[PDB]
Amino acid sequence: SCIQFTRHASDVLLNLNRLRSRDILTDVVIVVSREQFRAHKTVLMACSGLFYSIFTDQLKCNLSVINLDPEINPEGFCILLDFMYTSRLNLREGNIMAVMATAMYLQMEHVVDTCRKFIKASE
Amino acid sequence: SCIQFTRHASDVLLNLNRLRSRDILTDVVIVVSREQFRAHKTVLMACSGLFYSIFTDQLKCNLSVINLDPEINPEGFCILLDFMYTSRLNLREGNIMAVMATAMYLQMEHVVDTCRKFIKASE
């Protein structure tokens, strides 16, 4: 018999992004080819199968620095980190291959699906 | 020129609630008349003007235990904590006064608004 507030989830995510932009309560640095990205472990886990696996590990859950595979492109990661905190994906002809490869590595199934579809349309 | 995934914010919140239910990466205990509630500081801040003020304070941001005012009802808090992580509010004739008072103290404006409206309809 609950009532539901339609905009609640979007409002929560908007506030989580405001905390990220002001570097409030960020608890991890993600290192991608020397580029560094500060974030909230919980948001990373909520969006990515890879971060979910990492931060549920009894040893890795305590790390303040996570280094990604050297093949990962920093721009592709930045676009995906922006998507995690906003639901918006900056998908362009020039970045789609790097975004899809990063989303496959991060295990972000819905992003991989839209990249596959946009690539299929161009062929 | 971004594309947007409609269900992303809801999916994020659903995963944050799964982490709460399994007590994964919870970093604070909220004490309400001896009842204890584990939660994520970032989610509390994203939903409540009171928690936002508390955890942006340079001293309180580091506390692992927060004690609420003794007038706060544990059931009213539990219903609001459930709303924070799900967008669903269990509003009933028997709890509406305690829920509204707790939402006013927590500074959750949209909850206060729906309580005022439901109370006005019954008069």
């Binding site: 609950c2 009532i3 539901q4 507030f5 339609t6 | 669903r88 509010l89 729906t114």
Partner: peptide, 4 residues
């Protein structure tokens, strides 16, 4: 607010 809606009835979910």
């Amino acid at each position: 607010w809606v009835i979910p």
